[PDB]
Amino acid sequence: MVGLIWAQATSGVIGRGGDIPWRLPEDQAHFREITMGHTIVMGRRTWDSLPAKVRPLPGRRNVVLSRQADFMASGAEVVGSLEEALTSPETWVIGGGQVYALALPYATRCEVTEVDIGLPREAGDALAPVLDETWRGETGEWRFSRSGLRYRLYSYHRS
């Protein structure tokens, strides 16, 4: 099982300036619940975004994709191809934009948080992958985050 999990603005933006232009504690807790215990696979730029104290993310096999043969990620495995990362019953691809696009052909689940923020797409933004007709989606109800932004959870599945 390969799943993708991400949070996006309604525009599709997932990252900007190497970080994220929001933070919803409820979305982080949801991310923790879904990924805990499993393999998480991330691009090197997303590893760089992690604060030193949650590097590695605890209780998970942290895998970092890089073309740098000597890149060092203390507490993670660095691999040079996505296929090397897929050796566990449940693998969660946690981004960013480049790695979501690379992993989508392997994926059967997407757990999406839509953040009700009006954020036009700018050059250099990382974007969510586009999900074609093979993806069956189910939406949850809109929820208020204590951050003040509304959000809702989408669960996409395909065989």
Ligand X SMILES: NC(=O)C1=CN([C@@H]2O[C@H](COP(=O)(O)OP(=O)(O)OC[C@H]3O[C@@H](n4cnc5c(N)ncnc54)[C@H](OP(=O)(O)O)[C@@H]3O)[C@@H](O)[C@H]2O)C=CC1
Ligand Y SMILES: Nc1nc(=O)c2c(CCc3ccc(C(=O)N[C@@H](CCC(=O)O)C(=O)O)cc3)c[nH]c2[nH]1
Establish if 50 lies at the interface with ligand Y (CB under 6 A): yes
Stretch that binds ligand Y, among 4-12, 70-78, 127-135, 139-147 (CB under 6 A): 4-12
Q: Is 8 annotated as ligand-binding?
A: no
Stretch that binds ligand Y, among 25-33, 62-70, 71-79, 83-91 (CB under 6 A): 25-33
If residue 63 lies in a helix (H) or strand (E), which one and from where to where? strand 61-65
Q: Is 57 annotated as ligand-binding?
A: no
* Shortest distance (Å) from residue 105 CB to ligand Y: 19
Q: Which of 31, 42, 25 is nearest to 97 (CA)?
A: 42
Q: Which residues bind ligand X (CB under 6 A)?
A: 6-7, 14-15, 18-20, 43-46, 49, 65-68, 71, 80-81, 94-99, 102, 126
Q: Which of 98, 155, 152, 87 is nearest to 128 (CA)?
A: 98
Choose, by CB under 6 A, the member of 2, 9, 27, 39 that binds ligand Y. Answer: 27
CB 40 within 8 A of CB 62: yes
CB 114 within 8 A of CB 57: no
